[PDB]
Structure 1
Amino acid sequence: DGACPEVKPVDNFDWSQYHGKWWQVAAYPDHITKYGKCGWAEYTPEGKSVKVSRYSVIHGKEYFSEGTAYPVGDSKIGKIYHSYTIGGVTQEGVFNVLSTDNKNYIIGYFCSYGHMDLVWVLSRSMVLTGEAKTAVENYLIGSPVVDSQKLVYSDFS
């Protein structure tokens, strides 16, 4: 119960880091079930947009999905639009970046109407270690909205 909490996205997001391979190292279970396990995505800059090609295993079957990403308003604010096309159905939406160091990791959040929350953590490496791990932990302890106990970490074995 409750409406979506008011989110305070970052003020320093660097869109130039939005390229290359990002591994989805953690997420809430509902996200893993809906959008799949073993998730990774390749981001390819195309002018003002970035193209997103994503792999995951959904209900035991592998899929690639495709989407386009654009910043909404000032790119520094970390409010990002993605379209998301899989199995011939397109969806679209806006999510907010809760935390990033503009180098190793990004934490994304989406909330819809009661209300359901989804959080996912992306990294340039398959495993969150050192610097990135420490930043993520500190963020979680002060975070008004992410429940750290609910995160499930990925097993890329």
Structure 2
Amino acid sequence: DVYHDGACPEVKPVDNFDWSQYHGKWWQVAAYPDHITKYGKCGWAEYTPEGKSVKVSRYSVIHGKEYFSEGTAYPVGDSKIGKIYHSYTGVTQEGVFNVLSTDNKNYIIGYFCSYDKKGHMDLVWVLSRSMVLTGEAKTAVENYLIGSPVVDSQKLVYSDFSECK
């Protein structure tokens, strides 16, 4: 678990998040290593809409063992600001994360910061409708990472949905 002296940075929230995109199968195409360790490699999730929320069934390989987690996600306050409550089971755990960037079509970048040792740990992940980022979505992703008051594009690990077992 990697810690960075100081409080979590202040983050500019998105203003156009669209909950309607999240159904079907989304692939976790990249993440920070602390996230891949904690919540697994080879990650993907099937989202099922249920009113103003989504049911999440998420597959990953965690400490070398396959797991399914059953979980939910919900908006927190105005849905457009991309503040997202999620639960995942287990042992059910819950929390809140925020959306750093999306094109409301192909990809979403999620972020969680967590601050008493003098510091914070950041977790970043990227989901996409396609197993691999190609082009348009990839370009969008490429640019957002640079002006990030918080994402270190060098620290991301891109998934390889190949070997995975």
Question: What TM-score results when the alignment is normalised by the length of structure 2?
Answer: 0.92
CA distance in 2, matches of 1:24, 1:33: 13
**Structure 1 equivalent of residue 48 of structure 2:** 44
CA distance in 1, matches of 2:12, 2:95: 18
CA distance in 1, matches of 2:10, 2:149: 10
CA distance in 1, matches of 2:138, 2:52: 31
Aligned residue among 81, 101, 121 for 1:77: 81
CA distance in 2, matches of 1:39, 1:109: 16
The CA deviation string for residues 10-54 of structure 1, in whole angstroms up to 9 with x for no partner, is 100001011111000000001000100000000000122210000
Aligned residue among 129, 139, 144 for 2:149: 144
- Residue 144 of structure 1 and its aligned partner are, at CA, apart by 1.1
Question: What TM-score results when the alignment is normalised by the length of structure 1?
Answer: 0.97
**What SS class does the counterpart of residue 142 from structure 1 fall into?**
coil
- Residue 84 of structure 1 and its aligned partner are, at CA, apart by 1.1
1:1-157 aligned within 5 A:
1-85=5-89, 88-113=90-115, 114-157=119-162
CA distance in 2, matches of 1:146, 1:48: 29
CA distance in 2, matches of 1:67, 1:51: 6
The CA deviation string for residues 100-131 of structure 1, in whole angstroms up to 9 with x for no partner, is 00000000000011100000000000111100
Q: Which runs of 4+ in 1 moved over 4 A?
A: none
User: 5+ residue gaps in structure 1?
Assistant: none
CA distance in 2, matches of 1:138, 1:107: 12
**What SS class does the counterpart of residue 143 from structure 2 fall into?**
helix
- Residue 133 of structure 1 and its aligned partner are, at CA, apart by 0.7
Instruction: Compute the RMSD of aligned alpha carbons.
Output: 0.6
- Residue 8 of structure 1 and its aligned partner are, at CA, apart by 1.2
